Amino acid sequence: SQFEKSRKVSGPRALQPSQFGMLCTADTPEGEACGLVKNLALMTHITTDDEEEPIKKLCYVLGVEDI
Amino acid sequence: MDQENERNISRLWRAFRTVKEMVKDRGYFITQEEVELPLEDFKAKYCDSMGRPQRKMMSFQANPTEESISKFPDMGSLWVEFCDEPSVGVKTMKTFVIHIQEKNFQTGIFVYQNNITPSAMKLVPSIPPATIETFNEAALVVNITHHELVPKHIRLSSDEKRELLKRYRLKESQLPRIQRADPVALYLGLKRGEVVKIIRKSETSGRYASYRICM
Amino acid sequence: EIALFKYRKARLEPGTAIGAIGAQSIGEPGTQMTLKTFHFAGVASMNVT
Amino acid sequence: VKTAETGYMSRRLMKSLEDLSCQYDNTVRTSANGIVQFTYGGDGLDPLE
Amino acid sequence: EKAIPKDQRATTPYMTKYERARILGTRALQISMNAPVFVDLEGETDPLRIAMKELAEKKIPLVIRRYLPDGSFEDWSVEELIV
Amino acid sequence: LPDVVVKGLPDISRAVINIRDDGKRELLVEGYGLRDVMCTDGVIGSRTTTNHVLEVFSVLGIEAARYSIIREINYTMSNHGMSVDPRHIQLLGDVMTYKGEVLGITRFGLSKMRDSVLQLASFEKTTDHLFDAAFYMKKDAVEGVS
Amino acid sequence: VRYDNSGCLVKREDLNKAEYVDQYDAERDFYHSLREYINGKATALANL
């Protein structure tokens, strides 16, 4: 990860509870990059943008009105 | 409304206590009947029959108590006064300056009422021998010296300052300095080049003294 | 004799750099601070530093 | 992150409490002989001994 | 600039730990430049070690000039100062 | 209009009254006055003490400002252990206020007494203390260890 | 010897508390505390 400035950070170095099974909760470096550098777990998957086009036409079938 | 005139007379009475204690601390002769008078000796002595406090019935004069004359030959009496208006303009303080220049007063302190105009502060170096002090009635309610934190400040003489600087082999520049317009300094009226003695009461050692010089 | 010898040797010796000793005796306990949120209050009334 | 602040407070406090030593008249002064305290701690006792 | 005589000395008559290390180092720096010693030393080296034998015997030919912050010389010979 | 004050002191956020171990009640505010708070009917003006050192200095003076700073440092360290043998704290509380004003250790704080230009050149924000030293022509007798 | 900051000595009845608290006061207070500590042993020996 990238920092903005290294003076008064205090936030993105603690362990968030929202990375349960997503990121590794143990393997972090010991030093200046403590908490700024993370690792993936075993059963994860980073996704890709697919089309964005047929999902919008599928919501209109399911009953939503246009704006 | 009389509810604002029942406890606001004790606001000025508590300042009237502090002016007596301050003129007692200078080394001037005051008695133990004007500083320890109760509220019964203040209602029918200073206020009106209707119930408001008078203005010109506060001014008195204090003389030194025959030992500070031997300690300080160049020291005389003062003339404490009190305001008439909530905001002092020109003519009342001109009357005060002419009063000091007329009746041979070496100093005189002025109790002020609410809010200072800038047209009244350029005249405070009027007389080059005789200086004046401009207090405030909101700053004279409580007494600073016997609070919890202010030790016993004692002004020294010109014979005692010479003995201090000879015994330590010093000059007037080495001593720790204290500033003008400080609530310790304007309480006792320190001039430039006057050494004050401080008796600190510590915990690890106990009681010990130090010295300060005024700028 | 013991009470006078332990007092006469206890005075501050002339020439001691007492400013350098006092500056390191304060800052070195300052370098072992964690967070340690305390309070000069009742049931969590004030957060004091 | 404490290792980045291992001496920042102690070095800044060292800027003023540096040139203070007790002279032979049992007074602690500065480098320009301007006196700062007449006896050390009110009693002149070395806190080491 | 004035020198205080012997009957008017006002400082302490004891030897400071700061003036024990400087007189010993000055004596050891003089001995290393082939100065004659005045002690029955056993055969060894390291002038800092054989200067301690002179300090324990108090046979060092120096004095410790103690300056006050106006010039108050106050001689203070070494053998007058006790350990 | 609905945030206009009615009665009270303007520079105090709130107030909590607290109970000690005995049957005594002591109020405490979180403001900045110490003069209008001390001048209040109901309380006594004998003893009150704030955390702010300059607030004590503007009301009480120089000598009552060091006696508070030797115990505020003593309070923030005795709540953890670590005895710092209070003569050190008294030496700290005397070098900050021996000039007649409480000024600490900052960029504008090291200029209390030190005439030494090179001692003041060992700090951040350089290239401005050399030029006024060369302009006002400091004599700069070398006496400090730095 | 206690001097009142202006030359000669202090009075005899001005030694408990005064406006002339000089130096060498912690040393004499230590001497009085050591006197009080020695007096605590003889008091217990007389009470036994």
Nearest to D42 among B175, B200, B211 (CB): B200
Distance of CA B78 to the CA centre of its chain: 10
* DSSP structural state of residue E55: H
Residue D7 near chain B (CB below 8 Å): no
The whole-angstrom separation of Cα F40 and Cα E48 is 72
The whole-angstrom separation of Cα B130 and Cα B132 is 7
Rg (CA), chain G: 15
Q: By C-alpha distance, which of B15, B13, B38, B35 is closest to B24? A: B35
Residue B154 near chain G (CB below 8 Å): yes
3-class secondary structure, E2: strand
Residue B151: its H or E element: none
Nearest CA in chain D to C10: D49
**Which method, experimentally, gave rise to this model?**
cryo-EM
Q: How far is D46 from chain A (nearest CA, A)?
A: 40
The whole-angstrom separation of Cα F22 and Cα F45 is 22
**What is the DSSP annotation of A1-60?**
---S-SSS--STTSPPGGGTTTB-SS---SSTTSSSS--B-SS--------SHHHHHHHH
> Which residues 141-170 of chain B have a CB within 8 Å of chain F?
141-144, 146-151, 153
Residue E15: its H or E element: none
- Among D27, D39, D43, D46, the residue to mutate for chain G (most G Cβ within 10 A): D43
Residue C4: its H or E element: helix C2-8
Tell me how crowded residue B43 is: count the other CB atoms within 10 A of its CB. Answer: 13
Written as six digits, the tokens of F30 are 């979180």
* Superfamily designation of domain E1-83: RNA polymerase subunit, RPB6/omega (3.90.940.10)
Distance of CA F112 to the CA centre of its chain: 15
The whole-angstrom separation of Cα F44 and Cα B64 is 32
Pair B20, B34: CB distance under 8 Å: yes
Tell me how crowded residue D27 is: count the other CB atoms within 10 A of its CB. Answer: 20
CA atoms within 13 A on the CB side of F29: 17
Pair B129, B106: CB distance under 8 Å: yes
- Helix axis angle for F87-95 and C18-30, nearest 10°, is 100
Give the helix, strand, coil percentages of chain E, each rounded to 5: 35, 5, 60
End-to-end CA distance of chain G: 39
Domains of chain B (ranges; CATH) run: 1-142 (3.40.1340.10), 143-215 (3.90.940.20)
Chains with at least 3 CB pairs less than 8 angstroms from chain C: D, E, F
**What is the DSSP annotation of chain D?**
-GGGGSSHHHHHHTTTSSS-EE-TTS-EE-TTS-EEESSGGGTTB-S--
- If you count them, how many residues does chain A have? 67
The whole-angstrom separation of Cα D23 and Cα D33 is 10
The whole-angstrom separation of Cα C29 and Cα A28 is 29
Q: By C-alpha distance, which of A15, A43, A39 is closest to A27? A: A39
